Amino acid sequence: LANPAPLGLMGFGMTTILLNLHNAGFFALDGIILAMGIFYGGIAQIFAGLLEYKKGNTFGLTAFTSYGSFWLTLVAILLMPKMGLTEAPNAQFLGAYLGLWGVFTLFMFFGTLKAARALQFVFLSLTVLFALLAFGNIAGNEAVIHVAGWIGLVCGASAIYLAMGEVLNEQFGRTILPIGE
Amino acid sequence: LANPAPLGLMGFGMTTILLNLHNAGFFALDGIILAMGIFYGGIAQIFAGLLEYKKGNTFGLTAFTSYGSFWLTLVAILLMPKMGLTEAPNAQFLGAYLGLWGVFTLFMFFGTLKAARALQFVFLSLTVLFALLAFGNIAGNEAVIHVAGWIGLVCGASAIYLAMGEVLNEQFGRTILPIGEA
Amino acid sequence: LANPAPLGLMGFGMTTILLNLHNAGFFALDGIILAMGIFYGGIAQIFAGLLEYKKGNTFGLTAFTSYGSFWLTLVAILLMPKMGLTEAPNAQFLGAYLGLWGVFTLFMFFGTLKAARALQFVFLSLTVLFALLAFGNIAGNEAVIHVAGWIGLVCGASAIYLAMGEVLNEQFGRTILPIGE
Amino acid sequence: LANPAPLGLMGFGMTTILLNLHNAGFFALDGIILAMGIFYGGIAQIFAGLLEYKKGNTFGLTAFTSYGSFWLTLVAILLMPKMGLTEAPNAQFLGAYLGLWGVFTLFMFFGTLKAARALQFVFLSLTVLFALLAFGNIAGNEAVIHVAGWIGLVCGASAIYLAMGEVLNEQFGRTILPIGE
Amino acid sequence: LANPAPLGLMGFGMTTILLNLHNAGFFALDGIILAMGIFYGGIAQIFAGLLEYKKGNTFGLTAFTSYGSFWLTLVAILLMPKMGLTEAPNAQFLGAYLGLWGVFTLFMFFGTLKAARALQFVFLSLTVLFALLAFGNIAGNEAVIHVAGWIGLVCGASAIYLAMGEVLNEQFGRTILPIGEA
Amino acid sequence: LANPAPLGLMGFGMTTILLNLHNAGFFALDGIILAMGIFYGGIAQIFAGLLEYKKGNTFGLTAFTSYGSFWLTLVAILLMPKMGLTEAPNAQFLGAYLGLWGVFTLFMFFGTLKAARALQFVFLSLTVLFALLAFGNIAGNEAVIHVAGWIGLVCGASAIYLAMGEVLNEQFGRTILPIGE
Numbered sequence A, C, D, F: 001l002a003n004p005a006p007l008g009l010m011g012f013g014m015t016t017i018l019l020n021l022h023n024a025g026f027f028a029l030d031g032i033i034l035a036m037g038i039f040y041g042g043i044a045q046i047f048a049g050l051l052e053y054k055k056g057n058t059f060g061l062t063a064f065t066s067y068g069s070f071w072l073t074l075v076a077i078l079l080m081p082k083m084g085l086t087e088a089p090n091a092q093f094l095g096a097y098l099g100l101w102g103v104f105t106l107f108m109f110f111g112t113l114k115a116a117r118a119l120q121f122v123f124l125s126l127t128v129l130f131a132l133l134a135f136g137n138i139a140g141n142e143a144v145i146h147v148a149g150w151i152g153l154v155c156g157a158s159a160i161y162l163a164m165g166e167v168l169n170e171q172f173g174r175t176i177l178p179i180g181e
Numbered sequence B, E: 001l002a003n004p005a006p007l008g009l010m011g012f013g014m015t016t017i018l019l020n021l022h023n024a025g026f027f028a029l030d031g032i033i034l035a036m037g038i039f040y041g042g043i044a045q046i047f048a049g050l051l052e053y054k055k056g057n058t059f060g061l062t063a064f065t066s067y068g069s070f071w072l073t074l075v076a077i078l079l080m081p082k083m084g085l086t087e088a089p090n091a092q093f094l095g096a097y098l099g100l101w102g103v104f105t106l107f108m109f110f111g112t113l114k115a116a117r118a119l120q121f122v123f124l125s126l127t128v129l130f131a132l133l134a135f136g137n138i139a140g141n142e143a144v145i146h147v148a149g150w151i152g153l154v155c156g157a158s159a160i161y162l163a164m165g166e167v168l169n170e171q172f173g174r175t176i177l178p179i180g181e182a
C-alpha cells in the first residue's frame, strides 16, 4: 500500500504556512487560507489519516485526522459569522481552543521521540505554535501572535520537507533528503 | 490495523471540555463549541467509531459513533433556529434528550468494567456529566449546571488523558501513562 | 467483525422516545427530534445498516438502512416547507406514508420469529407504533396519536435495552442483561 | 455477504407507490414524494446497486443504481424551479425523458426472462408505467396519467412483495412468500 | 464482480439523447437535461467508472469517470449563472471546451478498435458529436448544431444499444444482441 | 487493478489548457474553468489519487490528490467572494499560494527522474507554469501571465498525450504512442 503520510504533511504544510503569513502580518485572513483549510489542510489531510488505518499506524490515524478536523473547525469558526449563524469568536475561548490543541500536540510530541527527527521538529514547532497562539489570544498580545506566525512558517515548511523527504526517498530507494532517521 | 480509540477520545474529550467551559460559567455558547461539535467531536468521532468495525470492537463502534452523533445533533439543535428552520429548543425537552444520553452512558459505563480503569472513570464521570446537565436544565437550576460544568471538565480531561495514554503506550511499547489497563 | 446492531438500535431507540415524547403530548414537535432524526436515528442507523453487509445479515442491512432512511425522509418532510420548497405535508398522505412503513415493519416482524425475544418486542411495538401513528394521521385522531406516543416511548426504551443488552453481554462473555437469545 | 436487493426493491417500492398516488389523483405532488425519492428511492436504492457489485450481479448493479438515479433526477426536475435555477419542465421533454426510461426498462424486462417471475412482473409493470407516463405527458392526456398511477401502485406493491419475499425466505430458509422461482 | 459498463453507457446514452434533442431543435435547454447530467450522466457514470478499478479496466475507468465528469461540468456551466456565481459562458470558450472533449474522444476511439464494434461506433459517433458541437458553436452556425444534434441522437442510441447488448448477453449466456464482440 | 493515472492526467490536463486559455489572454476567467476545476480537474483527480493507494504508488497518491485539491482550492478562491464569504483574493497572496504549489511540484518533478519521459515533461512544464503564474501574480506582470498561458497550454496538452499514451498502450499490449517508458 502507498504511504499517505506525505499527503497529510503536504496538506498540513501548505495550510500551516499560509495561515501564519497572516499571523506574522504579511496579509490579512484571506480566503486563500480558508480554501486550503477546507480541502488540503482539511479533507486531503482527513484522507491521509483514514489511510493510515490499513497501515497500522495509530499515530498517523490520530495525527492527520485530528489536525485535518482542526482546520475544518478553524474555517467554521471564521465563516459561520459571515453566514449569520453565530457570533464572532471570543479570543479567550479561541485561546483555550488553541490551548487544548496544544495539549494534544504536546502529548503527541512525546509520541514522536521514537521516530524520525523531522517529525519530532514538526510536532515540537507545532507545540510552540499552538502554545504561542493560545497565550497571544488570551492575553490580547498581538506581538506574540506575530511570533507564532514565524514559528508556524517554520513548522509548515519542515512539514512539507518531510512530506517531500519521504516521497523522494521512496522513489529512488535511497536518502535523497535526510530526515534524521 | 490502527487503534482508532485515541481519535474518538480526543474528539470527545476536547469538545467536552470546551462546551463545559461554558456550562461552568467561563464563557457563553460561542461558535468554537459548535465548530468542535461538528468536525472533531462529531465527524472525527464518527470515523473513529466506524473504524472499530473491522477491529471487532462493538463497544467502540457503538460509543464513538453515538457520541459523534450526539455532538452532531447538539449542534443542529443550536443552529437550526439561526437558520430559520426551527425555534429555540424547549429547555425541558433538552433535559430528557440529555437524560436519554445519560441512560445510554450509564449502561455503557457497566461495559467498561473489564476495560482500562481510565475508561471506567470517563464513562462514570460522563454519566454524572449528562445527569447534572439534565436535572439542572429541566428545573432551570443554574447552580448545578455550573456544577455540571466542572464535572465535565474532569470528564473531558480524563478522556484526553486516556487517549494520550493509549498513544504513548503503543509508541513506546511500555506503559508510559498508567490507564488502569486490565 | 464488530456487531453494528447496538449502534443502530440506539439511534432508532433514542429518536423513537424523543419523537413520541411529542406524540404523547408532553412537548411540541421540536428541533431536538429533527436533529436526532438526521444523525443518530438516521445516518448513524444508515451506517449500522451498511455495516451488516459484510456481516451477511440481509435482515439487518434491510432494517437499519430503511428505518435510518425513514428518519431522514421524515425530517425532510417537516423541514422542506421551512425552506420554501414544499407545502405542509397532507395529514392523510403522511398517514399512508406511515402505513407503508408499518407494512414494511409488519413483514420484518415475522423475520424476527427465530431471533432474540427482545428483538421481537422491538418490531412488534414498532408495527403498532406505525399503525397508531398512521391511523391517527389519516383520521386526525388526537387520542390515537397520544396512545401511539406511549407505544413509542416503550418501543424506543426497549430498543435501548436490546442494544445495551448486546453490548454488555459481549463485554463479559455471558448474559448480563437477558434478551431471550 | 448480505442480499441488498430487498433494500432497493423496498426503496423502489415505497417511492413508486407514493408517487403514483398523486398520478392516480389521491393527492397532489407533496414533499412526502420528494423526501422519499431523495433518500429511499434515491440514495437507499443507490446503495442497493453499489452493493450488487461485490455480488457479481450485473443486473442488480444496473437496475438499482439506474432507477435510484432516476428518482434523484425526478426530484431535481421538480425542485430546481422552486430554487429559481430552471424553468418548469416541458411535458413533452418529460414524456421523452419518461419514454427513454421506458426503453431502458423494456430491454431490462427481457433480462428478467431467466429470473424469478415476481421480478419479471415488476419490470413489466414498470415498462407499462413508463410507457403510459410517456404517452400521457406527450399527448396532454390526464386520463392516461391516472391510468399509469394505478399501474404504478401495482408496480410498487409487487416490488415491496419481492423485497419482503426474499427476506422472509432467507430468514427461515424456506418459501414463506412464493415469488415464482 | 459485476459488469459496470452498462451503467455508464446507459447514463451516458440516455443523457446524450436528451441533450441532443435540444441541439436538434426539438426543445430548449430544459431542466431535464440538467437533472440527467447530474445524477445519471454524471454521478451514476462516476460510479460506473469507479467500479472499473477492481475490474482492471483502465479504459472504462478513464472513459466513464471522465464523461461522468463532463456531464457534471456541463451542468455547472449552465447553472452557476442562475446561481449568481458566474456569468453565461463565452460561446467560443464552450467550443474549445467541447473540442478538448473531442480530442479526448478521438484518442479513446482508437482504444476501442480491439473491443466491441458497437463501442467503436459509439466513440466514433461521439467524436463526430463533439466535433460538430465545437465548430457549430465556435462559429455560431446553428445549422451544424442541428446536424450535431442528429449525430448525437445516434451516438446516444448506440450507447444504450451496447449497454443493453451487454446486459442480455450475460443474462442469457448467449449473444442476444450482436455488439460486434471481438 | 486498473491504472488510474490516465483519468487524473486527463482531468488535470484538460483543466490546465482551459485555465491557460484565459492566462494566454484569449478569454476571461470563465465559469467553464471553474466547473472543470471542480469535477474533472478536481474531484476526478481526487478519485484518481485515492485509487493509487491500493496500487502502492505513494507518488501517485500524493500528486493527483494534491493537484486535485489544488483545483478545488482555486475554485473556492474565486467563488467565495461571490457568496459574500470572502474578499477578493490578494494578488501577492495568490502568488505565494501558486509558489507553494510550484515548490511542491518542483520536488515531485525530481520524483519522475526514473519514470517515463512524458511524465517528466508534465512535471517540468507544470513547475514552470506555476512559477510564471506565481511571479506574474506577485509582480502583477501581464506579459508573464501571457507566457504562463502558453506554458500551460502545452503542459495540459502533453498531459493528455501521456494519459492517452497509457490508455492505448495497454489496449494493444505494445507501444502505440511512445511515452519514453
Ligand SMILES: CCCCCCC/C=C/CCCCCC(=O)OC[C@@H](O)CO
Pocket (backbone or CB within 6 Å): C050, C051, C052, C053, C054, C055, D050, D051, D053, D054, E047, E050, E051, E053, E054
Ligand atoms: C462509490 C463506490 C466506488 C467503489 C470503489 C471501491 C470498490 C468497493 C466496491 C463495493 C461498493 C459497495 C458500496 C459500499 C461498500 O463498500 O460495501 C461494503 C460495506 O458497506 C459493508 O461493510
Ligand SMILES: CCCCCCC/C=C/CCCCCC(=O)OC[C@@H](O)CO
Pocket (backbone or CB within 6 Å): A050, A051, A053, A054, B047, B050, B051, B053, B054, F050, F051, F052, F053, F054, F055
Ligand atoms: C469513513 C471511513 C470508514 C471506514 C470503514 C470501512 C473500512 C475501510 C478502512 C480504510 C479507510 C481508508 C479511506 C479510503 C479507502 O478506502 O482507501 C482505499 C482506497 O482509497 C484505495 O483504492
